Design a protein around this nucleic acid. Sequence first.
DNA 1: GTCTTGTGTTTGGTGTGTCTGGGTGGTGGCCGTTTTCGTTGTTTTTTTCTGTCTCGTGCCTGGTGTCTTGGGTGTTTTTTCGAAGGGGACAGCGCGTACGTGCGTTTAAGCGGTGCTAGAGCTGTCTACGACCAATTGAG
DNA 2: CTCAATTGGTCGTAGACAGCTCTAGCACCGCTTAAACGCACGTACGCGCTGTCCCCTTCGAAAAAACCGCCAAGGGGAAAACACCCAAGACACCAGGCACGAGACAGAAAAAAACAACGAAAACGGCCACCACCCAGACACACCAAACACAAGAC
Lengths: 97, 97, 50, 78, 54
Amino acid sequence: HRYRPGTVALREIRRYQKSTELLIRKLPFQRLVREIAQDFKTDLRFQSSAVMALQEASEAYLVALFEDTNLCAIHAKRVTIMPKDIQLARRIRGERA
Amino acid sequence: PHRYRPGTVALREIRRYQKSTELLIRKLPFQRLVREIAQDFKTDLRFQSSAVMALQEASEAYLVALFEDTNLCAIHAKRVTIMPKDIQLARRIRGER
Amino acid sequence: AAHVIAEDVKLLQFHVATMVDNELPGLPRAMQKSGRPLKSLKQRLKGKEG
Amino acid sequence: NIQGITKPAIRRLARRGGVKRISGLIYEETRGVLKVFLENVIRDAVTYTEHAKRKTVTAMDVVYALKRQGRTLYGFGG
Amino acid sequence: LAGNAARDNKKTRIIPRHLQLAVRNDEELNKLLGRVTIAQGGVLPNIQSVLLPK
DNA sequence: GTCTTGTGTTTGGTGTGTCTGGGTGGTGGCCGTTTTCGTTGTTTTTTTCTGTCTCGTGCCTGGTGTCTTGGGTGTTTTTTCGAAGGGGACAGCGCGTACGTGCGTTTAAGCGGTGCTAGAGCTGTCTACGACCAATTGAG
DNA sequence: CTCAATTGGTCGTAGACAGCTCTAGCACCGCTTAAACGCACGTACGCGCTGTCCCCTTCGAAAAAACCGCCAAGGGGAAAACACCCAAGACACCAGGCACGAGACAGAAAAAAACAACGAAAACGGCCACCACCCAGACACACCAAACACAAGAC
């Protein structure tokens, strides 16, 4: 049969809040990191542990941002989070000016 | 007779107070409140008038910032202004309790 | 007036189509305003007695 | 590179974030915000690395950058 | 920045108004001082366009 | 199908270690010239005041438009769409009573004038204390 | 296995700490009136919704085509109403500027208090010797990093 759209979503939320491993693929993140750092300094090296620490901080930051954004959407009474939600979120956090 | 339409005066007021910088709370009420709260922590504390005024400046600027965030929460579906749900939201986005 | 020109061309489209097919689906059948529907060029040759 | 943060990866994160329904526009927004984030963090980390005269960015450099940013991370030494 | 704000306020003495205006008008000073509260600074004049009459 | 996985291994860059030693900053005394604070004079800000600007509410003159109307000639089988299911985003417009503008009354905030006092902070005396040290031990 | 933890002791001074006052923060009255309250009122924007828009689908709905031959002879009606004026006009609803209510504020005088200038005390800031240990640099290891390659697999 067909699962009514949105019924697997909650299941996935339940899984991914149960799970705790990192959710971005390790090498692609690492390469994005090396790229960004190259812009600041050439011939840089990273400890693997340092890259994993960056990924941890980045993911946990993003998770908290998504949480806040979701709350904004709910305040919009929207199930669907939107860029305007992220903007409002960060704005209230005072990240973006 | 004469009557400004709704919010005409309110806008004029906002313009006014954003032009000015005085304390918006009446001082002596605030001072009494501070004394009351402190009494809950410790009896027989003397407050430098300057220390009071400092607490007042902080409280006012903090609440004004909070109102700013709250009014930013108004934004969706061209909804207008602020309700306690908005306050609660903004505070939680800040991570305040 | 770009407003009205749209309606003018819509009505021209109605007349020209009804010249060659009176029996459009949904569109009002062109008529001699006293009742009788207009025999379009399709109808001149459409079926039996074409 | 940036698109290496795949749509499924961002979905997975937002699901961990409890997001039920996602506008596709969220993916590029997430990439932009994550880029800004990394930018700041890495800039601080390299600035420690530069001060240490190192070429290797260490885990401690990242920790100290996050400690500055108000993002204190436990797991790699304090 | 604060002296320029004072000048355009047509005042010779920089007062906390002007310090706050300067600090918030420059985005970079605002980032350096984003958590700071300035006594008697008030706010930048800013009304959300939603609020303005059409 | 994809080119990430992450194990497996390669090899050498560079990080960190240890060793040397003299450049450096700290310590100390000493001088001195700078800084702070107290007093006096003034110029800029603020207050009360006049007044005129100005923009809002909406009054007012009367204009741009309109729509009434006297007179009327003529204005059963086959295809394929494109529905519906399954769900949100949003939202136009209705409803309605919340809270804005007002006003009249009541309050007590503010001024400020005056009294009091206690403990903030200063200064002076003593030594409990933490730093340094040599000699000692075993916990990580 | 070893050097960071440990001890008894001295030093000398941090700060206990006790006194001392007089700062300024406590109460207090009391008159003024800005602001608070409260009430009326209403209109606008917080509530509501189902209109509908989006992804994917089939599939059943409208569409639309077809449905003796031909042949005879009635007896209707073809509106013409009323569209759409033409046209002339008085009629709104529309300008828009009148006009000044009420506020804002601009310009002025005046008061005053902020703050500029002058003089005084003193401790901080600088000069010098001199100290030594810190940190630079050198020389070295080695390991952890990049890198290559493959597996299986996340997309």
